Design a protein around this ligand. Structure first.
Ligand code: MG
Ligand code: MG
Ligand code: MG
Ligand code: MG
Ligand code: MG
Ligand code: MG
Ligand code: MG
Ligand code: MG
Ligand code: MG
Ligand code: ZN
Lengths: 69, 60, 94, 244, 91, 114
RNA sequence: AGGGCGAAGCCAGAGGAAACUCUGGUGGAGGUCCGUAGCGGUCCUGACGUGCAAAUCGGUCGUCCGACCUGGGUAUAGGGG
RNA sequence: AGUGCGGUAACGCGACCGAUCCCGGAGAAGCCGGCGGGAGCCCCGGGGAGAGUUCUCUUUUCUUUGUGAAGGGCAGGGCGC
RNA sequence: GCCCUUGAAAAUCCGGGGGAGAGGGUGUAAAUCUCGCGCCGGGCCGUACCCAUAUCCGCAGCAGGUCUCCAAGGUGAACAG
């Protein structure tokens, strides 16, 4: 797997053709964003909750966004 | 029951001549006892030197 | 003999022992002479020999091996290359 | 009765030589225009140990003078050879140590080893450990040279055939006592199955001609013909004189 | 003679092998384990690696020498003769 | 104490069958089989006993995978030969050629003299 | 396994005019000793002797860093190995 | 003009043309000792969760108390650079 | 440290030296021992269990024999009992 550091970078990785499920783990104090691809499972740690809630909307065409519980 | 007895062995007990089967060197190896000492005294010496307590030549 | 004239140089004159330091002395153009032990590595010697040629400096091949030369500098260590910057009052330099 | 130990060593099988870890043959360089007419220069890349051999060897690398290619050899080390030394060889080779040149060139009293018994053989006489030959004397016509071998014999030789100047390295090996049987065992194991050797006197009289008896004695004379069928030729073969 | 009067190196062998042999071994047994001087750098590091092959650890100069000594006498005497004859031939 | 078994049909403890202990997320100590220890390449000089710098000492059939930069170093004779032996080769090869020129000059003067 | 003995080398101190010698350490040699697993197989002329066994069992023993033990592969075949 | 650039240097940076030919390395090395680092296990002192004991004593005794490979970072080792 | 013991080959994989060639003509090329990502594939045979005081060999569920890995607490020099 691969961790990502820029909210833009994860948005670009999510926008690929190969991608699919962009599941979202609210850990408390963390809120990850795991986006599977062909090769790698990209994750992105977004410490803020409101910023995670904002990003939630910014995934594009109708991807899975299979929120995790 | 063991733990209790180990606490006795700490106090210096069940440890006299008649409860030793091994040689002294087996019980505490002379080499190890030496190694400790050098590693102490040498450490004391180079701490002294590196505080300007003792000079190069004394140290040596 | 050279051992006698050196003795005086080491006592009174300025000098430098060893390859890393003497090549720096020649390269400055201060070194007036360069003594080489006989056992010195062949590449090293020829390198030094060329550095003297460029700096118009004397090169004296010592009769002895680097242990003898260091003994001959009055040091308990062994020296293969030695430069003589300023002789004190000797006629090591002719 | 039996085929005796001795007759059996000829069939090889168990008594063949052990040669896994042996580093190669210990030849001389093969002759060619350069060797024949001038001198080819090579360098001693390393000095080596060769199991079952008291002499150390020397990887000596030359340059093939036809293909761009660094050919290499295994000389037996002349004593005083060392690495990063050059090893010149040929007719016009300089008469210093570890320097293979024809016996005809080199002067009288010149000590050599790995000396070619017949021209072009690649080094056959005197290649043991502390051993060498001495060039006695030359006959300019007939192109022949007389050489004194380590056995004492004074063999005649073609002046063309080469030798390395100097003696073989690792001399005086046999001054050290072995002491331990173990130390013997370990010697011959890197060579061949020839060690703990049982005296024919010990054996029953089917496996050796000295065998049998109620007392460990020989019973017949231990000297013997060499017009002797293999199976009797045992003890002292063709022994000219026998005692101390 | 701190620990032994007269065995030294060959005290390892204990009683075994006989007095003469052990005396005979002491000469070699010493020389072979001796650290000699590398006539190449001049450090005291010439150490027998295996029979007839001595290696300087610093110089990295492996040197075909004797079985129990960096030099045999034979080798030395042979060296000088060859040098003499070399000079006699060329002039 | 949790004792354990080998994970493969190779029973014997060999060069091939080397292991290590690992605690899993399942909380059971399990053997993992270990990869052999790769060596850095030694120098082309052959005297310098020390192995080369700036090269990933890894089992040779891996090198395949690795990038070029891991496998070598930016120098002439890079990742084949230690620096010291290059800068001695360099000045050797130079100084030799200067003397060859000097002997050529002494030869040419001798021809002109004779 | 674990112990014993403590060879070269090394340190200090003391003596010695020198040669070098003593004292205390350190060091860890060896087909070295004890002794386990291992390998073996001394004695009881023990057990057993239509056996557990067409050679086994028990104690007692030898050896246990080396001419050590040992799997697989491979070689040598009958007046032959 | 342009088959990449940085560092005094060890060397570095995500890539950095290239044949036959040549050289080198890795694969690729005995046994034994000593010392050191890293883990697994043991041990000790406590936190919890469940236990057993409780005639008297026992802040009890017992169990259990996790993070694969592959990446990235950083200790910690080593260097005959 | 030990050796009159010096302790495997090869398949495979890489590095370097060389510089025969190739590339496009001022926005692109050939080039990536290619950097990052993307796509497709990996056939064949073995895979149960026993592995030993009852799955093996000793005519047997025979006190025999038969190569390895893992290896807790106490006592104790100790994988001794
Ligand atoms: Mg008999
Ligand atoms: Mg007969
Ligand atoms: Mg295998
Ligand atoms: Mg690099
Ligand atoms: Mg009986
Ligand atoms: Mg009966
Ligand atoms: Mg029964
Ligand atoms: Mg199975
Ligand atoms: Mg079982
Ligand atoms: Zn080098």
């Amino acid at each position: 797997p691969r961790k990502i550091e820029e909210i833009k970078d994860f948005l670009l990785t999510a926008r690929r053709k190969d991608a699919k499920s962009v599941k979202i783990k609210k850990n408390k104090d963390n809120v990850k964003f795991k986006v599977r691809c062909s090769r790698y499972l990209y994750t992105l740690v977004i410490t803020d909750k409101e910023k995670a809630e904002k990003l939630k909307q910014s995934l594009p065409p109708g991807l899975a966004v299979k929120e995790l519980k | 029951r063991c733990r209790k007895n180990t606490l006795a062995r700490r106090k210096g007990r069940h440890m006299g001549i008649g409860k030793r089967k091994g040689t002294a060197n087996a019980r505490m190896p002379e080499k190890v006892t030496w190694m400790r000492r050098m590693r102490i005294l040498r450490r004391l010496l180079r701490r002294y030197r590196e505080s300007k307590k003792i000079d190069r030549h004394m140290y040596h | 003999s050279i051992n006698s004239r050196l003795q005086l140089v080491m006592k009174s004159g300025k000098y430098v022992l060893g390859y890393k330091q003497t090549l720096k002395m020649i390269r400055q153009g201060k070194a007036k002479l360069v003594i080489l032990a006989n056992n010195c590595p062949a590449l090293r010697k020829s390198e030094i020999e060329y550095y003297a040629m460029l700096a118009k400096t004397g090169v004296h091949h010592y009769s002895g091996n680097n242990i003898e030369l260091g003994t001959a500098c009055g040091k308990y260590y062994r020296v293969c290359t030695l430069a003589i910057i300023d002789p004190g009052d000797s006629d090591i330099i002719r | 009765g039996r085929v005796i130990r001795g007759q059996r060593k000829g069939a090889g099988s168990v008594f063949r030589a052990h040669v896994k870890h042996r580093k190669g043959a210990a030849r001389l360089r093969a002759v060619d225009f350069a060797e024949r007419h001038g001198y080819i220069k090579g360098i001693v890349k390393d000095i080596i140990h060769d199991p079952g051999r008291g002499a150390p060897l020397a990887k000596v690398v030359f340059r093939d003078p036809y293909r761009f290619k660094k050919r290499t050899e295994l000389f037996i080390a002349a004593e005083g050879i060392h690495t990063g030394q050059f090893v010149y060889c040929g007719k016009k080779a300089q008469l210093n140590i570890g320097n293979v040149l024809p016996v005809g060139t080199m002067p009288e009293g010149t000590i050599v080893c790995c000396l070619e018994e017949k021209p072009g053989d690649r080094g056959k006489l005197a290649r043991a450990s502390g051993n060498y030959a001495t060039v006695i004397s030359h006959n300019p016509e007939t192109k022949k040279t007389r050489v004194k071998l380590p056995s004492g014999s004074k063999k005649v030789i073609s002046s063309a055939n080469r030798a390395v100047v100097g003696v073989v390295a690792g001399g005086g090996r046999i001054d050290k006592p072995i002491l331990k049987a173990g130390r013997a065992y370990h010697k011959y194991k890197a060579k061949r199955n020839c060690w703990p050797r049982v005296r024919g006197v010990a054996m029953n009289p089917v496996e050796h001609p000295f065998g049998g008896g109620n007392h460990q004695h020989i019973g017949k004379p231990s000297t013997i013909r060499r017009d002797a069928p293999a199976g009797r030729k045992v003890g002292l073969i063709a022994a000219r004189r026998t005692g101390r | 003679a701190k620990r032994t009067k007269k065995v030294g190196i060959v005290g390892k062998y204990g009683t075994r092998y006989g007095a003469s042999l052990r005396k005979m071994v002491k000469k070699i047994e010493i020389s072979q384990h001796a650290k000699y001087t590398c006539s190449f750098c001049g450090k005291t590091k010439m150490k027998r690696r295996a029979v007839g092959i001595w290696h300087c650890g610093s110089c990295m100069k492996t040197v075909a020498g004797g079985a129990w000594t960096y030099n045999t006498t034979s080798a030395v005497t042979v060296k000088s003769a060859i040098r003499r004859l070399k000079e006699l031939k060329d002039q | 104490v949790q004792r354990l078994t080998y994970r493969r049909r190779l029973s014997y403890n060999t060069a091939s069958n080397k292991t290590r202990l690992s605690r899993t997320p399942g909380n059971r100590i399990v053997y993992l089989y270990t990869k052999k220890v790769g060596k850095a390449p030694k120098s082309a000089c052959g005297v310098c006993p020390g192995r080369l710098r700036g090269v990933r000492a890894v089992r040779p059939k891996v090198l395949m995978r690795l990038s070029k930069t891991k496998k070598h170093v930016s120098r002439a004779y890079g990742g084949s030969m230690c620096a010291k032996c290059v800068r001695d080769r360099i000045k050797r090869a130079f100084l030799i050629e200067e003397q060859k020129i000097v002997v050529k000059v002494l030869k040419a003067q001798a021809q002109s003299q004779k």
